[PDB]
Amino acid sequence: GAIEACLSAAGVPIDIPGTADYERDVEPFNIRLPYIPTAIAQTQTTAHIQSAVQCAKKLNLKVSAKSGGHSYASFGFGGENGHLMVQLDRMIDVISYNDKTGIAHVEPGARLGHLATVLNDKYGRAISHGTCPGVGISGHFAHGGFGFSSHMHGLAVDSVVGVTVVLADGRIVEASATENADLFWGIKGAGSNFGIVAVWKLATFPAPKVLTRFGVTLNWKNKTSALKGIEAVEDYARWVAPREVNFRIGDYGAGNPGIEGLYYGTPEQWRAAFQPLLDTLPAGYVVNPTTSLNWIESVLSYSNFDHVDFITPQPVENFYAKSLTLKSIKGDAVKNFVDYYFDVSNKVKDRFWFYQLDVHGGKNSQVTKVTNAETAYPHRDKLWLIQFYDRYDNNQTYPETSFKFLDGWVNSVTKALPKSDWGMYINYADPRMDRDYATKVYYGENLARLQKLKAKFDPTDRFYYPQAVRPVK
Numbered sequence: 001g002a003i004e005a006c007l008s009a010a011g012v013p014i015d016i017p018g019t020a021d022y023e024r025d026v027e028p029f030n031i032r033l034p035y036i037p038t039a040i041a042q043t044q045t046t047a048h049i050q051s052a053v054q055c056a057k058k059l060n061l062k063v064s065a066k067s068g069g070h071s072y073a074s075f076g077f078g079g080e081n082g083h084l085m086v087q088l089d090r091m092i093d094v095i096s097y098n099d100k101t102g103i104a105h106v107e108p109g110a111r112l113g114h115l116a117t118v119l120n121d122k123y124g125r126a127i128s129h130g131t132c133p134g135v136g137i138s139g140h141f142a143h144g145g146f147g148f149s150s151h152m153h154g155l156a157v158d159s160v161v162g163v164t165v166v167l168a169d170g171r172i173v174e175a176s177a178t179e180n181a182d183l184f185w186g187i188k189g190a191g192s193n194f195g196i197v198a199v200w201k202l203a204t205f206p207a208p209k210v211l212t213r214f215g216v217t218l219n220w221k222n223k224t225s226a227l228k229g230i231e232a233v234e235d236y237a238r239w240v241a242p243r244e245v246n247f248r249i250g251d252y253g254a255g256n257p258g259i260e261g262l263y264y265g266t267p268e269q270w271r272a273a274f275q276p277l278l279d280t281l282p283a284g285y286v287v288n289p290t291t292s293l294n295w296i297e298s299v300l301s302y303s304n305f306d307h308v309d310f311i312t313p314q315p316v317e318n319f320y321a322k323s324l325t326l327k328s329i330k331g332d333a334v335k336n337f338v339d340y341y342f343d344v345s346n347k348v349k350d351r352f353w354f355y356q357l358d359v360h361g362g363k364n365s366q367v368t369k370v371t372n373a374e375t376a377y378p379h380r381d382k383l384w385l386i387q388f389y390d391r392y393d394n395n396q397t398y399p400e401t402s403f404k405f406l407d408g409w410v411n412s413v414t415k416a417l418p419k420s421d422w423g424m425y426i427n428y429a430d431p432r433m434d435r436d437y438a439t440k441v442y443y444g445e446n447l448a449r450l451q452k453l454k455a456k457f458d459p460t461d462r463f464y465y466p467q468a469v470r471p472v473k
């Protein structure tokens, strides 16, 4: 048909329904949420991306880029059927590395494990990003990107010093502090809104040689212990936690919470640094043996796979997820959170679920050294980044009634807070919110500026998806 002909006329490779490449490319990470693009352009160059955007304009189509395909909402498809999908995941190279500056230029289809492998093995370098090796660089970096080096070195987005971008009108432009700084600001936290990033330009650091993985089995057997433990962790996070300590509270055992973390330094330095928290934890915790690691080893250690260099998708999952970013969990919020934890969550046994309470902000958190005004990322004044995840087996249907489980847990916290105290993180995209509400919680104090920038760069909503920022002149 018309779109296939258009793409082929411009030399853009297209997927053919029924072939291996098509089946691979069209499969969402979240199989709860498949969409059917009108066509898939499997791009190899910037020029391909550009030509694909031209065809979209010619045929009046919406266009969506898919990088690693990890959108919890399948937004890489456009979050609905019938978009032109620009499939980026064969564009995987570290294009160049400058050893005077430590800056790398990277293609937009490189996955985190692959990015980390190439930068380590070829250049001895590292970037602070997420833990999942199959996550795409573009979705991740465009909206933040949090992991076990973030307390020490900041968000994935904070490594970004420039981009090459294909705009809605087909132009290719550079953005950085010194050129299209307004576009640059939007790309850094809300990047899916403003074009298709074709090259990431990224500051790196020397790959650390000395790292310690640590863990604490909390043994919170009841509401009271959990309430006291979460209070104690917030205290340590807000006022004490050194830069070198990166951690979260996680429960993957419906009642077996643990601290997991990464410390920049030796096991003995970790213990001394963490002791103030261990001293205030409810009694009964058990400190796990530490593991000594270098950089590449730490990448493998938190990956949940037997390798990290992914150039293909990871196995798919079938799930629903939600998020919160909070100034503080103290007060009725934690009370309500723990009530639900014990009276509802721990009795949910028909599928796997977890929460993670990530130490995102706090006095010594590198994430907080950037303010909300400085990039699109709006969560700089939030101490907690919280993930809620609800997963069924791939041979089951996610039940229509199951949504109320995560909805109720999140409501347990939000009902206790003024709206100004909390947001939501679009890297944990939750499609069950209308366009206005979603963008309000995803972008906080930066939404109004983002709406203007949207009117400037994508006034026809060419890159539309249901939780894109609205263009408002």
Ligand SMILES: *Cc1cc2c(nc3c(=O)[nH]c(=O)nc-3n2C[C@H](O)[C@H](O)[C@H](O)COP(=O)(O)OP(=O)(O)OC[C@H]2O[C@@H](n3cnc4c(N)ncnc43)[C@H](O)[C@@H]2O)c(*)c1C
Residues within 6 Å of the ligand: 029, 064, 065, 066, 067, 068, 069, 070, 071, 072, 074, 075, 076, 077, 088, 108, 129, 130, 131, 132, 134, 135, 136, 137, 138, 139, 140, 142, 143, 144, 145, 146, 147, 191, 192, 193, 195, 196, 197, 198, 314, 426, 427, 428, 429, 465
């Ligand atoms: C599946 C998965 C997700 C994880 C995991 N671990 C995370 C972690 O340790 N920290 C985090 O901060 N986040 C974690 N996430 C969530 C991911 O961060 C998000 O799901 C990312 O958005 C995934 O990025 P990507 O794989 O590239 O997702 P896509 O679905 O392809 O696109 C997302 C979004 O971005 C737009 N987009 C893609 N490509 C571009 C370009 N080049 N330019 C502009 N916009 C782009 C898409 O259109 C879509 O809107 C661990 C696991 C296992």
Ligand SMILES: O=C1N[C@H](CO)[C@@H](O[C@@H]2O[C@H](CO)[C@@H](O)[C@H](O)[C@H]2O)[C@H](O)[C@H]1O
Residues within 6 Å of the ligand: 013, 014, 015, 016, 017, 019, 020, 021, 022, 042
């Ligand atoms: O769905 C598809 N889409 C991809 C993207 O076009 C096709 O790949 C191409 O197939 C071409 C034709 O054989 C090869 O020359 C080229 O190297 C290869 O990338 C693949 O054969 C086809 O099944």
Ligand SMILES: O=C1N[C@H](CO)[C@@H](O[C@@H]2O[C@H](CO)[C@@H](O)[C@H](O)[C@H]2O)[C@H](O)[C@H]1O
Residues within 6 Å of the ligand: 131, 132, 252, 304, 387, 389
């Ligand atoms: O953002 C994220 N997203 C993914 C979800 O897509 C999480 O993966 C989970 O991490 C858990 C903790 O290791 C595992 O037990 C679980 O099986 C695995 O799916 C990962 O820990 C988290 O950082």
Ligand SMILES: *[C@@H]1O[C@H](CO)[C@@H](O)[C@H](O)[C@H]1NC(C)=O
Residues within 6 Å of the ligand: 221, 222, 224, 225
């Ligand atoms: C919770 O567990 C702790 C551990 O012993 C205990 O002190 C406490 O009595 C238990 N329950 C309550 C309601 O405190």
Ligand SMILES: [Cl-]
Residues within 6 Å of the ligand: 019, 020, 021, 022
């Ligand atoms: Cl094929």
Ligand SMILES: [Cl-]
Residues within 6 Å of the ligand: 435, 466
């Ligand atoms: Cl809409």
Ligand SMILES: [Cl-]
Residues within 6 Å of the ligand: 435
């Ligand atoms: Cl709309």
Ligand SMILES: [Cl-]
Residues within 6 Å of the ligand: 455, 471, 472, 473
């Ligand atoms: Cl308007």
Ligand SMILES: [Zn+2]
Residues within 6 Å of the ligand: 114, 117, 118, 309, 310, 311
């Ligand atoms: Zn590789």
Ligand SMILES: [Zn+2]
Residues within 6 Å of the ligand: 231, 232, 235
């Ligand atoms: Zn306290």
Ligand SMILES: [Zn+2]
Residues within 6 Å of the ligand: 305, 306, 307
């Ligand atoms: Zn393997």
